[PDB]
Amino acid sequence: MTYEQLARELLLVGPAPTNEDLKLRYLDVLIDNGLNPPGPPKRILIVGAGIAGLVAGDLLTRAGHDVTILEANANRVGGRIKTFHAKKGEPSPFADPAQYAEAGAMRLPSFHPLTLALIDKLGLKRRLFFNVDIDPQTGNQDAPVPPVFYKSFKDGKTWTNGAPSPEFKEPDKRNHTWIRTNREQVRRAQYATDPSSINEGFHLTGCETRLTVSDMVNQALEPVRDYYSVKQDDGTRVNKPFKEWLAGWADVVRDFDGYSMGRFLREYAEFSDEAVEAIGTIENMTSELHLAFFHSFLGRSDIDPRATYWEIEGGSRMLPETLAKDLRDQIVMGQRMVRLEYYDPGTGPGGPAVAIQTVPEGAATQTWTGDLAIVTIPFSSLRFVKVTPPFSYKKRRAVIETHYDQATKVLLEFSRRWWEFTEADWKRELDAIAPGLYDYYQQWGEDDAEAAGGVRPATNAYGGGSTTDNPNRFMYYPSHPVPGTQGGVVLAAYSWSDDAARWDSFDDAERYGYALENLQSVHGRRIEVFYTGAGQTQSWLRDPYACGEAAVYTPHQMTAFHLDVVRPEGPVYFAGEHVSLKHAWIEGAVETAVRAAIAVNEAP
Amino acid sequence: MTYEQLARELLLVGPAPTNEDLKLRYLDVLIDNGLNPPGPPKRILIVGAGIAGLVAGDLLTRAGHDVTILEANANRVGGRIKTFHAKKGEPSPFADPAQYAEAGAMRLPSFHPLTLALIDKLGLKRRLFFNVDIDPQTGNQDAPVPPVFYKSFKDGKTWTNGAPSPEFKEPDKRNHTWIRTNREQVRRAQYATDPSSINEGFHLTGCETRLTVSDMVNQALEPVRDYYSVKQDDGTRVNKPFKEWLAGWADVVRDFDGYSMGRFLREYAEFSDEAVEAIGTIENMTSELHLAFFHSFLGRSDIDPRATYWEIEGGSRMLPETLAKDLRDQIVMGQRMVRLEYYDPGTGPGGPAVAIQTVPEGAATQTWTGDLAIVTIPFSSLRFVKVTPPFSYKKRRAVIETHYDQATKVLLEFSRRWWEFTEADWKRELDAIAPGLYDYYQQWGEDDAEAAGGVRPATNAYGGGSTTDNPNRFMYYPSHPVPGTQGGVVLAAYSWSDDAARWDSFDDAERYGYALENLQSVHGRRIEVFYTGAGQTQSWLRDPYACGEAAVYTPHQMTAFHLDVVRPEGPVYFAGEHVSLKHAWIEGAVETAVRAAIAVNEAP
């Protein structure tokens, strides 16, 4: 009110006095029971065949309703879940036809139970996603995968997917990947023990030099966490009682939504400009500084985002495609919504309540009618749709003003996994190709020029990723090799906002040359030997169906109209990543999709 | 120090104790005298053939130096000065081969003397640019064009281009153009007299309803203007004495650069969210809210930006192309800088001080050597250049962190100038095409659906532009008809940042359909009759040579590193729009170009 209702939307708390944990509700519907009870059968139109439209479409189809899912894309479902894999007719995206890589979603955390449990329910195998590079000679991933476990704020209630897996063990993290800033290059393990050398590269002085950018961030967020939490002597934090925990989060909204992350680190935490430059570079907050503090704080209110990540065997595309198998009659491809007409008594009486006119991608027009509608397309895409009658004023402003972040990924295929090589592996692998080739690159050295002469050391890393200040910014290595293959696809460039704005000023074929050179600036020129020449890129700002990476609020935007983002417009409901407060996560879309399916199922 | 030196950069004040007016210096060099005296002849490399590289190239060539201007574009000079006109071989961009429109710069203010005087010196005719629609039956534009006049802060010194023109008179403004927000549509003259109806459309209440968004902005900026200025009883403002005027501006930097424009209007001016929504919609500040207050405040510290604008006969391209005629031997086309190597004693001693390696657009490589260098390419473009040795740390961060705004223009050609039509003109012009066609569109009406049924009224406007909340946002009409023609090219869509981010998620041929429909939402469906089918668009975020519209700082960025943006890096100097504080203006580039030519001409 308004802050308390925002905190309820954030923490998934039902209305008073019950204060129901909506996460438990969503798990009961999505996994355990379904839509109980099945409401009056309705004709339901669903716009968009991403994970939100598919989750809601599956749930409502199995509940008895007559569902039609209109999808603008002509060949592919899943939306922002896109995997570069070899389709049957098409040529393969890479040289090795078995190689694949992600254009969108790639890692799924353990604290997102809906998405993980949905993956298991559909019978998909999931492996560990190595967010930090690991020791491949540790842990036990041959054991059955541990079940999905969620702990609720409500009393001591929990939710579990299956029997525990005591022999499954995560491999030990190495932190042997690189951090190359200001023409100097160390390893994450060395930066943790002595951050002084790198921090001085950002012209830091005094106490901030002997602190890692990670610790600096967490120390600054401690007084904010004190609103809803209590720091223990363990270093662990426990949440305050529900009354003071809900009011504590509501005070974070009141006192910090008007802050950007940059203004927070500069004025509230009193960090130097040099400290922010170092933090934003190594921790990926440069191009998020001018965006809302709350957006950045939400992913990282955890003080151990050292948790478990997962990825699907065969690609993230397995999740939406498996759902699409149970929706063959419902999914209509190649139909883009251009006109949304609905009837709000608060297309007329006695007739259909919702009329959607589509245009073939890319009959002249088709009109789809129904009783209720679920629009799961991004607001950057809804912006070009004509509507009658007008939505509520505050939602219209939400569709107009919602900032949509930019994101571009550049993928380079390699015939060998050179990032796992030791220096001895380099000597053998290069000479095997041609005698004397190893010594040849030793004498050649490294280019002094860098977009930010001794041969770079061997990376020798399994999974994880390296950070740099050249346009590539972040470079992820595959967590698991494709069996029967010898190569792998490196995520050579991955950035957001202004950093991504650099890449999406060029075309796709113009991206591979720069990304390889900037990859050599960190790992060495000699990696060019194993480059197959095949590359893939995905600019989400320039995708006609996504029109951006994800909804990312600027300061105060959430307080202004987010409570109006979720509110239905008569017979028109809204789901998707932008409707939740878990922006740019699959879980946020699955949350609002299940939430929308519940509301439309029991509608009068 | 640091604020005072920023205020000196802003106001073009030379160093103490002389406190020279640099604008007078730049006028003396660019127009009157030149580089006096001609310094030691040098080999100078200039990167980029936009207005900054051309102004500096012309000045240094005529001063005796050996200049080579490397331009990445293979066919066109001028950079962000781009005009859609019919070239000799090419097919014409529109149906009428005589029609032209601007892809970039289009209006030149009277308070930008360098650009206006440069246009006159090159012998180019300039007409009035009607920023607000005018009465074509008023004023006298047949008289000779008035000379360029500039008033300096220094004492009572002025600068004039030529003899005055007392008979030249600007046409009276009509404000008959449209403002269509929240499904309601009035005219700018009616909104000025009674803003109550439109403001209530943004859900405003109380005193703010009876105030135009324009007046609300100026009232909020009055205490800021009180820093450097004094409000008179005339309503006019005079500047304080130089001591308190320079320190006043330096206090604006100190107290407001950490503000965004949204945070300023919300926290300092205490406007409601509804007030900001109304202001940002009608006055074009929605997608600039999260950007620096200082960036937005700089264009509008004037309380009468009701001043005189100008445009060049034949297109804005006349200005760079005319300069390019005097640089035929110096300009090298189709060569993109990929590696910048220089020698800074503070490519070695005894040899060339600057070595630039280029790649043909789009010999494998070419190396260009010289004694000094002037890089006029945007920082979004320099970001992908490899450099040795590294620039100063703060400049490197400036190249990395500088936000570059997005901008897209959509141009639609029409066989007639329907925006000048009266209702009687509509009746005759439609029936002339086909009998009964006028009545046909009267019965057809207007689509109720809108991306935000009685036939829209006749616009009947000459010049100026209309404002709306649909994706087109701003629509400008040609100020002057092309003689011998009957049609004209409407700027159907023109937006920045998030508003422009919507359009540059589609391709060029995908833009014309939406822009015409949204144009009909304001002017009427019946305008489709005169649409020739030919369109032109320009997405500057997706231009490989611009990589964005212009440098636009986020909060605090200017205080952080702008003094390091201008600072030379040994033998490498920097010019361009981003180097000045007049971002997204031609004048800012001409300022830094002349400023760079002066420094490199007298270099030891």
Ligand SMILES: Cc1cc2nc3c(=O)[nH]c(=O)nc-3n(C[C@H](O)[C@H](O)[C@H](O)COP(=O)(O)OP(=O)(O)OC[C@H]3O[C@@H](n4cnc5c(N)ncnc54)[C@H](O)[C@@H]3O)c2cc1C
């Ligand atoms: C680069 C990137 C990386 C990501 N990584 C992760 C990650 O590691 N983990 C994670 O959990 N999440 C990640 N995400 C987020 C996740 O991919 C999405 O949030 C998720 O797909 C939810 O999307 P959605 O269902 O809300 O909408 P979308 O997936 O975008 O679905 C929208 C659908 O609507 C269709 N559509 C659009 N316009 C129209 C129209 N006019 N008419 C009809 N149909 C239309 C589109 O074709 C599309 O299929 C990432 C996102 C990006 C961009």
Ligand SMILES: Cc1cc2nc3c(=O)[nH]c(=O)nc-3n(C[C@H](O)[C@H](O)[C@H](O)COP(=O)(O)OP(=O)(O)OC[C@H]3O[C@@H](n4cnc5c(N)ncnc54)[C@H](O)[C@@H]3O)c2cc1C
């Ligand atoms: C949509 C829009 C509207 C505008 N309207 C106005 C207006 O009404 N009034 C006004 O005064 N200003 C306006 N401007 C601004 C004005 O057009 C520019 O500020 C002006 O052109 C100054 O540009 P510049 O010389 O600094 O650089 P640019 O004009 O951008 O020149 C850069 C040049 O460098 C070249 N180049 C780029 N990368 C490389 C490389 N790697 N190697 C070699 N060469 C390279 C490019 O090809 C280009 O020719 C507008 C700008 C835009 C985008």
Ligand SMILES: NC(=[NH2+])NCCC[C@H](N)C(=O)O
């Ligand atoms: N602009 C953003 N913060 N986007 C989201 C980044 C995190 C993303 N969901 C991931 O798994 O990597």
Ligand SMILES: NC(=[NH2+])NCCC[C@H](N)C(=O)O
């Ligand atoms: N993002 C911006 N404010 N860009 C500049 C807008 C003004 C522009 N120079 C013009 O003449 O119209």
